[PDB]
Motif scaffolding. Sequence first.
Motif, short mmCIF file in Angstrom:
data_model
loop_
_atom_site.label_atom_id
_atom_site.label_comp_id
_atom_site.label_asym_id
_atom_site.label_seq_id
_atom_site.Cartn_x
_atom_site.Cartn_y
_atom_site.Cartn_z
N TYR A 1 22.04 -52.52 58.08
CA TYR A 1 20.78 -53.26 57.97
C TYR A 1 21.06 -54.75 57.95
CZ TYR A 1 18.45 -48.84 56.95
OH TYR A 1 17.94 -47.56 57.03
N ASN B 1 14.73 -46.26 60.63
CA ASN B 1 13.50 -46.83 60.09
C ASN B 1 12.79 -45.88 59.14
OD1 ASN B 1 14.09 -49.03 61.66
ND2 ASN B 1 12.64 -48.53 63.29
N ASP C 1 10.35 -51.10 58.75
CA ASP C 1 10.64 -51.85 59.97
C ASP C 1 9.46 -51.78 60.95
OD1 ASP C 1 14.16 -50.94 59.81
OD2 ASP C 1 13.12 -52.73 59.07
#
Length: 331
Positions: free
Chosen positions: A48, A159, A173
């Motif tokens: 991330y 996500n 996201d």
Amino acid sequence: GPVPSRARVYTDVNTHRPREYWDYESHVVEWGNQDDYQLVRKLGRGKYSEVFEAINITNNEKVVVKILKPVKKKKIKREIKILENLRGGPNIITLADIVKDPVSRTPALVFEHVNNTDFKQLYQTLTDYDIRFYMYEILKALDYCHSMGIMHRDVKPHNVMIDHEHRKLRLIDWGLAEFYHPGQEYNVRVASRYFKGPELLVDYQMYDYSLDMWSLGCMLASMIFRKEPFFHGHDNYDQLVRIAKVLGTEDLYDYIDKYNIELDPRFNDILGRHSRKRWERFVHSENQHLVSPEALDFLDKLLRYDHQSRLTAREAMEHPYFYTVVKDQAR
Ligand SMILES: O=C(O)c1ccc(-c2oc3c(Cl)cc(Cl)cc3c(=O)c2O)cc1
Ligand SMILES: [Cl-]
Ligand SMILES: [Cl-]
Ligand SMILES: [Cl-]
Ligand SMILES: [Cl-]
Ligand SMILES: [Cl-]
């Protein structure tokens, strides 16, 4: 030219809303105070980007700070308006605040703090009931944001955060999300290659919520068949070829002719001719305890070329694949 297309459900949700609900360019972002938050440590390092655990010193509460990469002001306001519109929705990440650096003027989102057991640790040890449960939780998030006129456009395991201890799930996201408006043409450079729907690979711009249902189908296929990713294309053209090697080219050309999609000339020879491979062909021994007749029937109704033929999120939630999951959550 291309034949127009409209979503089967939630077609006019934004039209019935006031303009300020979806007109994110006219929205005035009210930025908070960056000094209200102190960064503690990095989260999801390596996978991330710019995700930090932080403390809200004004109430001594843990939060998550996401520092956004330099993009256009239009995309910043779009994501913020979408997150604020979806705040409070089931399994949707909760946006807590919006801050900006004083000198560098770098935007940053502040989210609620939850646990995350990433898919890379759970993909290897997910039970048949666990697959159904988390799929249903994702569908609840998708039905909500679709009912609120939002396309996520980037559904994929990265996500989706799962709290395996609390049996919680969050869709995150939303930087690629957009509002659905009937008749609007959308960018086809959305989602990741492995989860791109055929409408993106043939450059059909008038797509809708059903794009998210294709991506979900790709996630389901990778879980019950233990093949990550299920459609493993090496470029945009190869992605459609690998889909065609499973669904067959007969329905692909019917899809192309249905919407008068002028496919590029050399691409037609790329696809060639492939028969449809039944879903039982991808089952063997280790992935056997995850495949059921209702699982294959449900997957077949998601992985359809025709975006208007795929199940909606609500129709998917009522599929018998989730029958016991629905009754157990009701207790
Ligand atoms: O930009 C976004 O949409 C967005 C939203 C939320 C998060 C987010 O990430 C976490 C990660 Cl990576 C690890 C852990 Cl242990 C906890 C969290 C968390 O609580 C959390 O909210 C990341 C990005
Ligand atoms: Cl990221
Ligand atoms: Cl992913
Ligand atoms: Cl777009
Ligand atoms: Cl493949
Ligand atoms: Cl839907």
